[PDB]
A and B are shown apart, each in its own frame.
Chain A
Amino acid sequence: IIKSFKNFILEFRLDSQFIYRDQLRNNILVKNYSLTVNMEHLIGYNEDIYKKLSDEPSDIIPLFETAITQVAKRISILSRAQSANSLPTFQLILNSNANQIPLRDLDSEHVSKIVRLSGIIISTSVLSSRATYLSIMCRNCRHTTSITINNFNSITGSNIGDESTKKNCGPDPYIIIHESSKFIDQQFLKLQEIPELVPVGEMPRNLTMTCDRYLTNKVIPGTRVTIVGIYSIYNSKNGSGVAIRTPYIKILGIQSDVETSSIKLYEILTNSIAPSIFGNEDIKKAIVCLLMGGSKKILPDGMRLRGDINVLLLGDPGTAKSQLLKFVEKVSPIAVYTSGKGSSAAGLTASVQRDPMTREFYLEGGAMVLADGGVVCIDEFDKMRDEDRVAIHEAMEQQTISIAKAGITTVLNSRTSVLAAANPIYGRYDDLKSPGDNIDFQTTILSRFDMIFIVKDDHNEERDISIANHVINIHTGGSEISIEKMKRYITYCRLKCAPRLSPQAAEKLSSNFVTIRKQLLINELESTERSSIPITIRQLEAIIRITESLAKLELSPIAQERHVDEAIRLFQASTMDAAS
């Protein structure tokens, strides 16, 4: 079967061409060792060993490796002899775009089962290594043996890690030499199922994962990925990680676009961004452009054009942060569920954690690591300690967070608007003092912050009479272009876009600010009770960028006047209200 399979992998040719040999020969010389071979080929070219692989991929994908590296030899070494010794072997990257099985499978029948699995990952990409061909010299018998662990690609990340202690004059005659024995640093990653998925089964689901050579940081949030399902086990803990059924895996990790491998609709949105929500056109436009994203430009200048830097949306419960967070999450890739001082199992600046997967301090991926793509939502925001105010302020000032602690010094990249809200102090003291004041008041914390807001839900006059019925309430009692479709338009504007602003509405905004300043330089003769006429110069560019995003809503390479003028009116209402 070895020769038939060796030939059949030579014949593996998807509906494109014999790309897996020429591209192979032209890819080994620098980086691409083993080309990612999408596995729509095996389903038609050899159905017998296709069933064998869907049944027992443990001791078969090593034959895949052997045949693919052997044909890689037969081609690249021939081109070497035509152009200019060992040609170190490869670990192929095999998976398919069909027959999807997320972590819905957890049972024990899945020893040696490959399934085209998609799923999210949170953290614990820890690094370790295992040997490929094991070199063990005996001391009490002088017996040198180069016995492999019996595979290099499907190793635990069925291989038991004993070494058959021979004649026992000494406690360990057979001793490992790790120089002559070749090994691979394989990172011990973790696997979770996608929480944004209609098919759900076995609510407790979790497996391990391996990143062999370049499998690290190839999966990005929100993508329909194709990784290996599960592998046999050196049995885990039993009464590690979770106790029951924690195997080491042999994942190969193909990643591409959701739908591919190598191989006027807005007039219904005038209110549809809010199927049931009420008003607050300013905060709601903030929310729709938050779902949009704003501007992002790299072209030559002395900075990068930022978008939606900051909002202080602090407001009372009743606003139903439930529905806000749930709809944004359903539309966003992964809504960064930040809890005050903590990002994920650590603080805002990620804290290192001594994981027993490596039994060492690994940098626990922070919310920030998972925040590129989705808007940070800070709940429990009021009880946040003042000790890391400047920490978040620094992040707000740039984007990324520079986490530099014991052993780990990295500026981990984060790129999204903010969300700040909690139950305001003194009840509705926010009404008397500034729109801020959900947390401490000191004017220094407020410095880097940009925009403050108040939310209007359908309970305002319940403070005069309805409160009575309110306690009696205790006694006696989508319609829009889909969430995934908005995420799709957003990924297709991250791909390519140039919907810039328009000069005429730009000068209109410049007017409706400068002429305000001129009417008020004239009204200084009236000696206005406004404390100190401020420079509305960062809020102004904020409005400019929000009109830019409202133009991104309409693809116009020079902004249409409709969205820009609407945003202009609403943000002058907001700024004017703030001034009041």
Chain B
Amino acid sequence: SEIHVRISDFPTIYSLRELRESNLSSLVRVTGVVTRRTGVFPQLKQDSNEEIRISFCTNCKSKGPFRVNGEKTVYRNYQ
């Protein structure tokens, strides 16, 4: 369906004890140990993936709550 690339190696070896806001959204290579893991998630990812932003998409929007489903939505393999 789609291909994503992977990169070989960086010289940047920022240890977990060293990460700053300058580094965020950039590339980082870290060591460590997998403490614990989960299973596959069908993550959510006019509220596309908000479920907290509903302006006037409700019939009883004053106080009567409208309920959205959590399905029919795109699912990304997510561990």
A/B contact in complex, CB under 8 angstroms? yes
The complex places the Cα of A239 from the Cα of B76 at a distance, in Å, of 7
The complex places the Cα of A239 from the Cα of B40 at a distance, in Å, of 11
- Which residue from chain A places its CB closest to the CB of B71 in the assembled complex? A237
Contacts of A239 in B (CB 8 A): 42, 75, 77
The complex places the Cα of A191 from the Cα of B75 at a distance, in Å, of 27
- Which residue from chain A places its CB closest to the CB of B72 in the assembled complex? A238
Instruction: Name the distance in Å between A167's Cβ and chain B's nearest Cβ.
Output: 17
The complex places the Cα of A239 from the Cα of B77 at a distance, in Å, of 8
Instruction: Name the distance in Å between A406's Cβ and chain B's nearest Cβ.
Output: 28
Contacts of B75 in A (CB 8 A): 238-239
- Which residue from chain B places its CB closest to the CB of A171 in the assembled complex? B59
- Which residue from chain B places its CB closest to the CB of A239 in the assembled complex? B75
The complex places the Cα of A238 from the Cα of B77 at a distance, in Å, of 12
The complex places the Cα of A239 from the Cα of B78 at a distance, in Å, of 11
Interface size class of A (residues with CB under 8 A): under 10
Instruction: Name the distance in Å between A241's Cβ and chain B's nearest Cβ.
Output: 14
Could you name 4 residue pairs across A and B whose Cβ atoms are closer than 8 Å?
A238-B75, A239-B42, A239-B75, A239-B77
Instruction: Name the distance in Å between A245's Cβ and chain B's nearest Cβ.
Output: 15
Question: Which positions 35-79 of chain B face chain A at CB distance < 8 Å?
Answer: 42, 75, 77
4 closest cross-chain pairs (CB), A and B = A239-B75, A239-B42, A238-B75, A239-B77
- Which residue from chain A places its CB closest to the CB of B73 in the assembled complex? A239
The complex places the Cα of A239 from the Cα of B42 at a distance, in Å, of 6
- Which residue from chain A places its CB closest to the CB of B78 in the assembled complex? A239
Instruction: Name the distance in Å between A153's Cβ and chain B's nearest Cβ.
Output: 30
Interface of A is mostly: loop
Contacts of B42 in A (CB 8 A): 239
Contacts of B77 in A (CB 8 A): 239
The complex places the Cα of A579 from the Cα of B75 at a distance, in Å, of 67
User: What sequence of 0s and 1s flags, for each residue 232-251 of chain A, a beta carbon within 8 Å of any chain B beta carbon?
Assistant: 00000011000000000000
The complex places the Cα of A239 from the Cα of B1 at a distance, in Å, of 13
Instruction: Name the distance in Å between B66's Cβ and chain A's nearest Cβ.
Output: 12
The complex places the Cα of A238 from the Cα of B72 at a distance, in Å, of 8
Instruction: Name the distance in Å between B67's Cβ and chain A's nearest Cβ.
Output: 13
Instruction: Name the distance in Å between B1's Cβ and chain A's nearest Cβ.
Output: 12
The complex places the Cα of A240 from the Cα of B77 at a distance, in Å, of 18
The complex places the Cα of A532 from the Cα of B18 at a distance, in Å, of 76
Instruction: Name the distance in Å between A170's Cβ and chain B's nearest Cβ.
Output: 13
Contacts of A238 in B (CB 8 A): 75
Instruction: Name the distance in Å between A238's Cβ and chain B's nearest Cβ.
Output: 8
The complex places the Cα of A296 from the Cα of B5 at a distance, in Å, of 66
The complex places the Cα of A238 from the Cα of B42 at a distance, in Å, of 9
Question: Which positions 131-182 of chain A face chain B at CB distance < 8 Å?
Answer: none
The complex places the Cα of A37 from the Cα of B77 at a distance, in Å, of 47
- Which residue from chain A places its CB closest to the CB of B43 in the assembled complex? A239
Instruction: Name the distance in Å between B42's Cβ and chain A's nearest Cβ.
Output: 5
- Which residue from chain B places its CB closest to the CB of A238 in the assembled complex? B75
Instruction: Name the distance in Å between A27's Cβ and chain B's nearest Cβ.
Output: 46
Instruction: Name the distance in Å between B76's Cβ and chain A's nearest Cβ.
Output: 8
The complex places the Cα of A293 from the Cα of B42 at a distance, in Å, of 50
Instruction: Name the distance in Å between A40's Cβ and chain B's nearest Cβ.
Output: 44
The complex places the Cα of A239 from the Cα of B41 at a distance, in Å, of 10
Instruction: Name the distance in Å between B29's Cβ and chain A's nearest Cβ.
Output: 30
Instruction: Name the distance in Å between A236's Cβ and chain B's nearest Cβ.
Output: 12
Instruction: Name the distance in Å between B22's Cβ and chain A's nearest Cβ.
Output: 36
The complex places the Cα of A239 from the Cα of B73 at a distance, in Å, of 8
Question: Which positions 229-279 of chain A face chain B at CB distance < 8 Å?
Answer: 238-239
Question: Which positions 204-251 of chain A face chain B at CB distance < 8 Å?
Answer: 238-239
The complex places the Cα of A119 from the Cα of B42 at a distance, in Å, of 31
The complex places the Cα of A239 from the Cα of B75 at a distance, in Å, of 5
Instruction: Name the distance in Å between B72's Cβ and chain A's nearest Cβ.
Output: 9
The complex places the Cα of A30 from the Cα of B3 at a distance, in Å, of 62
The complex places the Cα of A549 from the Cα of B21 at a distance, in Å, of 79
- Which residue from chain A places its CB closest to the CB of B40 in the assembled complex? A239
Instruction: Name the distance in Å between B38's Cβ and chain A's nearest Cβ.
Output: 16
The complex places the Cα of A356 from the Cα of B12 at a distance, in Å, of 48
Instruction: Name the distance in Å between A237's Cβ and chain B's nearest Cβ.
Output: 8
Instruction: Name the distance in Å between A255's Cβ and chain B's nearest Cβ.
Output: 38
The complex places the Cα of A238 from the Cα of B75 at a distance, in Å, of 8
Instruction: Name the distance in Å between A359's Cβ and chain B's nearest Cβ.
Output: 15
- Which residue from chain A places its CB closest to the CB of B59 in the assembled complex? A171
- Which residue from chain A places its CB closest to the CB of B41 in the assembled complex? A239
The complex places the Cα of A368 from the Cα of B75 at a distance, in Å, of 39
Instruction: Name the distance in Å between B74's Cβ and chain A's nearest Cβ.
Output: 9
Instruction: Name the distance in Å between A59's Cβ and chain B's nearest Cβ.
Output: 28
- Which residue from chain A places its CB closest to the CB of B77 in the assembled complex? A239
The complex places the Cα of A239 from the Cα of B72 at a distance, in Å, of 9
Instruction: Name the distance in Å between B8's Cβ and chain A's nearest Cβ.
Output: 30
- Which residue from chain A places its CB closest to the CB of B75 in the assembled complex? A239
Instruction: Name the distance in Å between B53's Cβ and chain A's nearest Cβ.
Output: 24
The complex places the Cα of A448 from the Cα of B42 at a distance, in Å, of 51
Instruction: Name the distance in Å between B78's Cβ and chain A's nearest Cβ.
Output: 10
